[PDB]
Amino acid sequence: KYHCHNNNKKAYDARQREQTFAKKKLCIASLICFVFISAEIVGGYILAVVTDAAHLLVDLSSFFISLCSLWLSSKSSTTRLTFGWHRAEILGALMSVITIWLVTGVLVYLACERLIRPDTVMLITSACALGANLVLALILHKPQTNASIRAAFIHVIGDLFQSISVLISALIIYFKPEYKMADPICTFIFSIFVLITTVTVLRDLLTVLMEGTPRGIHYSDVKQSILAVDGVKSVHSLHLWALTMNQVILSAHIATDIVGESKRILKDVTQNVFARFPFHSVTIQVEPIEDQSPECMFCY
Amino acid sequence: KYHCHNNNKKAYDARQREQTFAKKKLCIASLICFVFISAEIVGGYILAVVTDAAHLLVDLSSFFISLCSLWLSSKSSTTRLTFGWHRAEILGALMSVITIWLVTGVLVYLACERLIRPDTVMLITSACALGANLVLALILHKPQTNASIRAAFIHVIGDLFQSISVLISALIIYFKPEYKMADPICTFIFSIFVLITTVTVLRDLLTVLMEGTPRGIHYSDVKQSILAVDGVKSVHSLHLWALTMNQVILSAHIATDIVGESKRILKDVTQNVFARFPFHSVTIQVEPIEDQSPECMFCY
Numbered sequence: 001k002y003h004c005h006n007n008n009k010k011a012y013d014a015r016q017r018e019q020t021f022a023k024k025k026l027c028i029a030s031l032i033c034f035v036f037i038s039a040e041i042v043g044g045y046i047l048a049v050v051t052d053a054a055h056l057l058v059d060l061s062s063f064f065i066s067l068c069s070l071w072l073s074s075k076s077s078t079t080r081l082t083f084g085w086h087r088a089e090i091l092g093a094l095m096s097v098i099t100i101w102l103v104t105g106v107l108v109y110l111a112c113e114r115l116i117r118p119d120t121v122m123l124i125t126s127a128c129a130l131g132a133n134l135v136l137a138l139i140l141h142k143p144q145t146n147a148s149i150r151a152a153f154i155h156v157i158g159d160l161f162q163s164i165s166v167l168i169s170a171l172i173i174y175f176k177p178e179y180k181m182a183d184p185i186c187t188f189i190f191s192i193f194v195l196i197t198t199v200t201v202l203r204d205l206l207t208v209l210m211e212g213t214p215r216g217i218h219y220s221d222v223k224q225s226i227l228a229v230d231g232v233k234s235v236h237s238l239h240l241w242a243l244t245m246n247q248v249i250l251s252a253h254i255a256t257d258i259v260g261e262s263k264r265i266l267k268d269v270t271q272n273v274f275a276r277f278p279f280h281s282v283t284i285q286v287e288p289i290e291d292q293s294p295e296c297m298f299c300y
Numbered sequence: 301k302y303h304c305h306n307n308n309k310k311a312y313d314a315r316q317r318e319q320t321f322a323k324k325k326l327c328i329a330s331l332i333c334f335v336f337i338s339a340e341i342v343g344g345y346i347l348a349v350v351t352d353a354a355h356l357l358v359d360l361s362s363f364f365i366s367l368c369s370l371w372l373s374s375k376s377s378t379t380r381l382t383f384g385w386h387r388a389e390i391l392g393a394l395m396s397v398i399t400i401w402l403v404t405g406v407l408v409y410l411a412c413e414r415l416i417r418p419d420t421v422m423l424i425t426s427a428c429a430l431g432a433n434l435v436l437a438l439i440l441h442k443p444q445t446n447a448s449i450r451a452a453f454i455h456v457i458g459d460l461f462q463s464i465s466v467l468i469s470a471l472i473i474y475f476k477p478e479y480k481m482a483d484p485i486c487t488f489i490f491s492i493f494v495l496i497t498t499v500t501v502l503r504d505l506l507t508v509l510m511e512g513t514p515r516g517i518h519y520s521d522v523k524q525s526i527l528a529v530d531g532v533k534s535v536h537s538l539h540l541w542a543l544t545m546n547q548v549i550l551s552a553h554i555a556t557d558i559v560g561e562s563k564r565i566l567k568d569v570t571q572n573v574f575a576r577f578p579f580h581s582v583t584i585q586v587e588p589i590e591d592q593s594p595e596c597m598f599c600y
């Protein structure tokens with residue numbers, strides 16, 4: 001009694017732990033961020049206007065989309081969306097990365113306008129921003145890393161460079177009142193670095209959305225595993241795609257010389273395929289060797 | 301010699317015509333839009349009209365992403381991205397819809413600021429904007445509509461309402477100099493309508509990106525078609541998802557009572573499945589009746 005669902009539990013329990021573990025850190029980070037929100041209010045009474053609220057507001061806002069997607073991803077499979085809502089944490093994480101591009105562009109425009117209209121508080125604001133951001137970096141931070149932690153961490157550590165830039169600009173100005181042109185150019189030399197560290201995340205997250213082969217698995221390795229069976233002769237129209245970052249699905253065709261005894265081949269191939277990676281699901285068809293064609297364009 | 305690729309040509313030639321036909325209209329629209337761009341330059345020599353023509357700038361830009369995606373979608377399938385770049389026109393169209401939300405939000409901010417700082421050229425600018433936009437509506441505008449024409453059309457016809465709002469505001473002010481508060485509120489009553497007509501596009505385009513069942517096909521109808529075969533007994537873990545708007549893929553399990561004679565079942569089921577809809581591809585496994593289990597967390 002070899003049911004085809006026997007090996008699917010390996011990728012079921014591993015996923016369950018990841019979403020519970022991920023929900024633990026964001027809730028801790030959200031509360032820690034909320035504590036530092038009240039610090040600005042306390043300082044407002046005792047100067048009063050500080051721009052740290054804008055940076056901290058989007059950070060807390062970016063920590064509610066990910067919790068919402070993780071809360072939403074637990075829904076049951078339906079007639080529509082047959083695979084389930086398990087891809088909702090890719091779209092949820094993509095919106096977080098988009099915020100970094102939009103936020104940076106706004107600050108570039110404000111820094112650019114300093115040229116046409118040139119003009120202790122700077123030091124204290126930079127210290128608070130560089131303190132809160134650095135703390136959350138450590139709090140946030142074999143199977144590949146979660147698609148949501150890999151986005152929230154980039155958001156927190158991406159904006160740490162902006163706090164570095166203002167500290168350098170304020171320190172130079174406070175010691176040298178002249179050469180005020182360094183402040184507008186200080187942001188430009190550091191605004192690019194935020195746009196560079198978010199490139200390896202966009203590429204690793206965009207190929208999933210167009211059902212490309214995910215990192216950690218190889219097309220050539222999987223093809224060799226199937227061919228180890230004696231019965232199989234050739235594989236065509238192989239298909240690998242990742243439903244999420246650490247869940248993969250397989251689909252293929254298999255050609256065998258013997259028209260009969262096809263029941264035995266399915267048990268051996270499915271067992272051999274699962275002995276290399278925990279697959280979310282696998283669907284393997286069997287075609288007799290007579291039905292193969294030499295020069296089909298779809299076959300290649 | 302019933303090759304499994306025989307019926308895949310039905311959904312191959314139909315797709316080929318759609319991308320060639322779609323590339324014909326955008327090129328015509330881009331040139332027509334370019335002609336009206338030169339009208340702004342001609343009027344510049346002979347008055348606060350560049351701002352009116354700023355709307356036409358993003359429209360031409362929005363018509364280059366779609367042509368780029370259609371140019372890019374023709375690339376060959378590779379080891380990575382096994383299915384191909386055929387989903388690049390969903391991501392390309394999604395970015396066009398996002399532009400509508402960002403552009404509208406900017407115009408709301410400028411219209412909102414009129415309250416704090418109240419303050420023939422309006423008529424001529426509105427006439428030109430309402431003329432060019434209306435012409436492109438007709439130029440742009442059974443298988444479902446293309447995912448790129450359904451986005452470019454919404455962009456052109458979405459911003460026609462903004463040109464309507466300025467015409468109403470200018471006409472009322474020109475006749476009644478007083479009651480200047482109608483101009484700031486004129487945009488608000490018409491900025492919402494742009495955000496409403498773009499909702500049925502976002503939903504119909506987002507469920508494709510999370511591999512949901514596309515419009516035009518039904519889960520219950522497909523399940524009944526398979527069961528018409530005498531051999532098949534039960535189907536579990538059915539899976540439908542749309543690679544693009546008018547291309548669908550099928551994957552299922554089939555349980556049969558007779559352990560032998562499985563070669564005949566595959567030919568009948570595949571022929572019967574293709575006689576309801578032109579599928580991009582189909583992969584059907586066969587499982588013996590013994591391997592079925594009374595209950596599972598995956599079968600249901």
Ligand SMILES: [Zn+2]
Nearest residue numbers: 004005553587
């Ligand atoms: Zn099964």
Ligand SMILES: [Zn+2]
Nearest residue numbers: 293296299305
């Ligand atoms: Zn073929």
Ligand SMILES: [Zn+2]
Nearest residue numbers: 253287304305
């Ligand atoms: Zn085949």
Ligand SMILES: [Zn+2]
Nearest residue numbers: 005593596599
């Ligand atoms: Zn089962």
